[PDB]
Write a protein that binds this ligand. Structure first.
Ligand SMILES: OC[C@H]1O[C@@H](O)[C@H](O)[C@@H](O)[C@@H]1O
Ligand SMILES: OC[C@H]1O[C@@H](O)[C@H](O)[C@@H](O)[C@@H]1O
Ligand SMILES: OC[C@H]1O[C@@H](O)[C@H](O)[C@@H](O)[C@@H]1O
Ligand SMILES: OC[C@H]1O[C@@H](O)[C@H](O)[C@@H](O)[C@@H]1O
Ligand SMILES: OC[C@H]1O[C@@H](O)[C@H](O)[C@@H](O)[C@@H]1O
Ligand SMILES: OC[C@H]1O[C@@H](O)[C@H](O)[C@@H](O)[C@@H]1O
Ligand SMILES: OC[C@H]1O[C@@H](O)[C@H](O)[C@@H](O)[C@@H]1O
Ligand SMILES: OC[C@H]1O[C@@H](O)[C@H](O)[C@@H](O)[C@@H]1O
Lengths: 659, 659
């Protein structure tokens, strides 16, 4: 089970099973332990009021791949198959099931969220017979309980060459905010005259199906494909016609051309890769982290991932600083065009951030704690983070400036970076309060350590305000503009306080409380406001035992690992690397939960932090304040013989590290 | 586990658990293996388009009793309790859970579908402490995914004596057909000044909750109650205000008065009972059958049970001949007022039956195969039974006439029985076709053996038409009316054919096919068209091996048992009695599934048939063609020392049988 490219499960156990995801940054499909079914389907960019939080959410969507297979009238079930295996191929995001049905046939099915067609899915089914058999195949479109006012359609699209039978459903999200359309077809090798007749049944209010029979002689292979398109009024004004048009398009492109384009795009993503010699488990784990970030993002868009990507409804599909600080940095180094989409998400929502600032009595752009379609605040009102956790504005500024440092794109800086940096600096200049000593305070926030609520001069928050004001001032200089001199005066006098032991104080009421996650240590990395190696170490020593084992998210130990790598402490760096994600794993595919022993995968934020521990920690790679990627001193774990990181920076550099 | 009044489960196993129901004929509550939760709640008389069949259905309703209990901030779960037990007291329909929480407290909770208040539920919680503890109690109103457009309200109803905090939700069934309201309150012993403060939280789109804290010193008992009312626009024009009014009413009646009235009505139901000496398991099983029929019916209404009563959404909550032929006869003998409600259901729907007859080209009243609110046909269109299984009309006629035979109520016969019998006879007179030999045929039906579709002269169907025409003619005579002479001419010449071996032929295309269920044998019982004991036996011999073990419902073996009891064959009668339901049981409460090895309890139809095998078979009790209840020759199982049946007929007679 240490294949560096494949995650395998023998005999999926439904009593202890956490499905894996295939995704193209638009659709995510989460696996079921049941053969030829999927557990959940999530469409990016589609939000409505639904369950948790009384705010906008991702919506469970059509399980559009669900199929029933029968052999001589006998229904295929978990209980009557043997040698049942599931496998995720991380090279091309193919999820494959395979099983034996009694003495009759071997079945393999592979499905894909097509990498080049954001709204298109395909499953390919292969049946290899050991005896004569007749198969009955049904594809079911069940309207999930999350949707309403469904309509169930079926028609034949014909010409002299084809009969494309379309199984289509149209339905609405809970408040009617979004119309969803799904359209499926079967694709056959044998052509119009010989293909099976397709029947349509509408027997339930919430389910219709298309089906066919096929006789297969012993010792033959019969293959067919299911192609589906899934799209909403959030993506296109006429989703009903666009879904049918897409499925017709995909059917006439054909399986080979679809899979070839899919493969080409996945091959391109994997030109940026991390290779570890001497630790097959670490190699597979790091590949899974890269695979999930690649699956949950999309170049050339304005999409940004939630903390759980497209693996489900975690945190309602909202966008948080989880993107800017956790998932963005490793993507910026490996695939700057992915990072570009992530900051494009914020650029597009700058006006909503300006509106939030004005509603809360500030200047400039105040990015929301949680973002969705509009860019307005989406945090549940019972969470004080929505009203008071302000560092997100500085986190957006830091990511914008880092995008420019890595790419050197001055055209992007003028059009997009500077609008963000100027407006977010104006926010901080309005947010600070000057005290009698001429110092600047940021009073009454929720800390990055969210267990500290309505406190003053949070270390991380104050650090992000310093960086936002500094980076905005540097950006103005690149563009030949005079930044307001107040930005530098404020940045230079924002309070960052020490306790009597010389340790960075987390906030003005902090002595020795347990903390939820890294806060003061984030001043060392990522902010690099703390560079003195003795201060870094004093802060690690005091805070590293302040994070409890229970109910603490994977937003701490990866930072500890990276900081110990930078201190050239191999044993401590490796201890914290393992602790960052191995206690958070769920079977059978080693997906990552939010907290130690958690059961809510896949926490893409966690993967992003660990990938920083590997690339910026073990690999020593760093965003140079002057521009570009540089390498600082680092160590490898004892047991790692070689670390190879490919496709780094705009020059696509390979870095090799050894002992 | 052979308590004659109680069904007990130690350590409910959620991997193999079928919940038990408490019901008052209006609300059913199905148990969860989880402490202080319920799995499903069903409201009678509320139908909308939903899931199965694309036709009207019962709707899963508010799980209104769901509570979260925490001890010193620690949440009570399956995993952290011990000595966890559940018990159904069949004497008063109380479902009780009990467990120990660590070293802190023993918890008991009992809930009730109040027998006298159709729309009111109550749960009583008792906490007995072994140490000082603080409890947090939350009652959750989660809008189920079956409902939409919910509103979540909370208010205090106050006067100088009370503060009644009401937690209310209002929502709609899928198409908007029905508005549902639920309103809950906590009832405290200690009075207005000392009762806990109630908080209200609205943190989710589909859930709000009310909660309180309570400090309890070691070695104390703290008790409180949750009262809820659940009602729809199918029951009252203003369900929102009626639900709050009911909960206020129940709160000011108080727990003692509510439970006293509940107990009095259950005591009255159990004045009709079946006592078996020498077989504790049979005694408990037969009590469970009586308990479910009593729970799933209601005197003084026009309610009729579905095949699954209020145990869930089985057969969409529709009414079938399952009432008239299966659940009605044992209720007519034990509690004629229950049977009166069952036939009132049909009387109220006579106009819809007349409309169905006219749409399908017949005269009189054509009762639908499946009935719900209107009395129009509700069968899914893909089931040919809706269009072609016509015997239901004769089944309604037979139950109407039996109601008069048992009660002798000539006023009821004039007002209700005769309208039914006249209209259903007019239907059959229009339904038959006279052939060249002067015989009457009933062509192109689905048989009671539903595996025989679109066949001619079904034995059971033709028998029901004969009885309907005969009973209508007898009814006319009681009322001094001349029935059309054609009814008797047709009844006397409707075809019932024999095969060469002298066995009653199931239909004109029948030779030796497997059959789904009893059909030709129903001519012996219940129709009593076949009285010759050699003919009864010839028919049992030929057909008893024609019902497969798999996918055959519990509508056969109870008839075989009864017929063998009437033939004074104790071994065969007892064989078929056990086979009728023991292979259909689900743990841990021995609920009854539809088919052998099935997993869809509770099949109330099955219980009704078995209760006939016990009362009319072992007890020999019979509806006399001339009026009243008579006793015919019968036998007991070898191992039954005594069978006592109480409350029989309008004279409330006790029958005792021994060897
Ligand atoms: O349908 C898609 C196919 O169309 C043909 O016209 C092209 O020659 C193929 O290269 C292509 O794969
Ligand atoms: O992942 C979403 C959010 O989860 C919370 O547990 C953390 O405290 C936040 O830093 C994070 O943004
Ligand atoms: O979504 C509401 C809140 O959920 C909490 O669990 C997280 O710690 C917050 O970051 C988030 O804002
Ligand atoms: O430790 C986990 C807890 O952290 C808090 O900051 C959040 O507000 C809670 O929603 C969460 O359950
Ligand atoms: O609230 C209900 C109670 O009301 C009192 O007025 C009566 O005396 C009691 O008999 C009754 O149980
Ligand atoms: O219980 C509902 C229906 O179920 C079917 O299995 C039986 O064939 C019918 O006789 C019955 O009315
Ligand atoms: O509800 C549709 C049909 O379901 C079938 O399973 C039953 O055998 C029929 O009696 C019923 O009419
Ligand atoms: O034997 C069970 C089968 O009986 C048939 O009469 C019904 O139409 C089917 O719905 C059912 O599954």
């Amino acid at each position: 089970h240490q294949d560096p490219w494949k995650l395998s499960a023998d005999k999926p156990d439904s009593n202890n099973y956490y499905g894996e995801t295939v995704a193209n940054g638009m659709i995510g499909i989460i696996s079921s332990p049941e053969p030829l079914k999927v557990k959940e389907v999530v469409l990016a960019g589609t939000y409505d009021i639904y369950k948790r939080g009384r705010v906008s959410s991702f919506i469970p969507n059509y399980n559009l791949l669900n199929m029933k297979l029968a052999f001589n009238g006998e229904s295929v079930q978990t209980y009557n198959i043997n040698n049942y295996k599931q496998e995720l191929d991380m090279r091309n995001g193919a999820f494959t099931g395979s099983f034996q049905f009694k003495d009759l046939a071997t079945v393999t099915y592979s499905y894909y969220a097509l990498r080049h067609l954001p709204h298109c899915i395909m499953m390919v089914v292969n049946i290899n017979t050991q005896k004569d058999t007749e198969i009955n195949v049904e594809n079911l479109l069940e309207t999930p309980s999350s949707l309403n006012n469904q309509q169930n359609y079926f028609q034949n699209i014909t010409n002299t060459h084809v009969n494309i039978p379309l199984l289509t459903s149209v339905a609405f999200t809970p408040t009617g905010r979004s119309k969803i359309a799904v359209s499926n077809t079967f694709l056959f090798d044998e052509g119009k005259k010989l293909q099976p007749e397709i029947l349509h049944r509408m027997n339930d209010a919430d389910m219709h199906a298309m089906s066919f029979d096929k006789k297969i002689k012993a010792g033959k292979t019969y293959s067919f494909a299911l192609i589906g398109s899934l799209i909403s009024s959030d993506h296109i004004n006429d989703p009903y016609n666009e879904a049918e048009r897409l499925t017709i398009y995909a059917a006439l492109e054909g399986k080979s051309r679809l899979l070839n384009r899919h493969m080409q795009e996945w091959n391109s993503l994997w030109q940026s890769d991390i290779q570890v010699e001497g630790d097959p488990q670490a190699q597979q784990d790091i590949r899974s982290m890269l695979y999930h970030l690649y699956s949950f993002t999309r170049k050339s868009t304005s999409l940004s991932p939630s903390p759980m990507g497209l693996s489900g409804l975690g945190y309602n599909g909202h966008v948080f600083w989880d993107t800017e600080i956790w998932m963005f940095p490793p993507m910026l180094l490996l695939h700057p065009e992915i990072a570009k989409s992530m900051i494009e998400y914020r650029y597009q929502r700058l006006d909503a951030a300006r509106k939030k600032a004005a509603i809360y009595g500030y200047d400039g752009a105040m990015f929301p704690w949680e973002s969705a379609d509009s860019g307005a605040e989406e945090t549940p009102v019972n969470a004080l983070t929505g009203a008071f956790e302000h560092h997100v504005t500085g986190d957006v500024a830091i990511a914008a400036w880092q995008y420019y440092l890595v790419t050197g794109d001055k055209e992007w800086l003028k059009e997009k970076g500077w609008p963000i940096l100027k407006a977010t600096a104006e926010f901080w200049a309005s947010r600070v309060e000057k005290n009698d000593k001429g110092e600047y305070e940021i009073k009454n926030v929720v800390a990055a350590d969210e267990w500290a609520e309505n406190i003053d001069n949070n270390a991380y928050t104050n650090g992000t305000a310093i960086r936002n004001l500094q980076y905005a001032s540097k950006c103005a200089t690149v563009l030949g503009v005079i930044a307001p001199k107040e930005w530098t005066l404020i940045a230079d006098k924002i309070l960052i306080s020490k306790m009597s032991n010389g340790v960075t104080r987390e906030h003005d009421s902090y002595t020795d409380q347990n903390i939820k996650q890294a806060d003061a240590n984030l001043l060392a990395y990522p902010l690099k406001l703390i560079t003195d190696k003795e201060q870094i170490e004093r802060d690690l020593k005091y805070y590293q035992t302040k994070i409890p084992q229970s109910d603490t998210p994977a937003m701490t130990q990866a930072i500890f690992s990276l900081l110990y790598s930078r201190l050239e402490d191999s044993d401590q760096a490796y201890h914290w690397f393992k602790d960052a994600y191995q206690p958070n794993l769920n079977p059978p595919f080693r997906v990552i939960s939010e907290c130690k022993g958690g059961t809510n995968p896949y926490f893409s934020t966690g993967a992003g932090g660990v990938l920083q521990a590997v690339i910026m920690g073990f690999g020593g790679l760093d965003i140079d304040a002057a521009g570009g990627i540089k390498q600082v001193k680092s160590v490898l774990p004892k047991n790692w013989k070689k670390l190879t990181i490919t496709g780094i920076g705009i020059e696509k550099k390979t870095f090799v590290l050894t002992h």
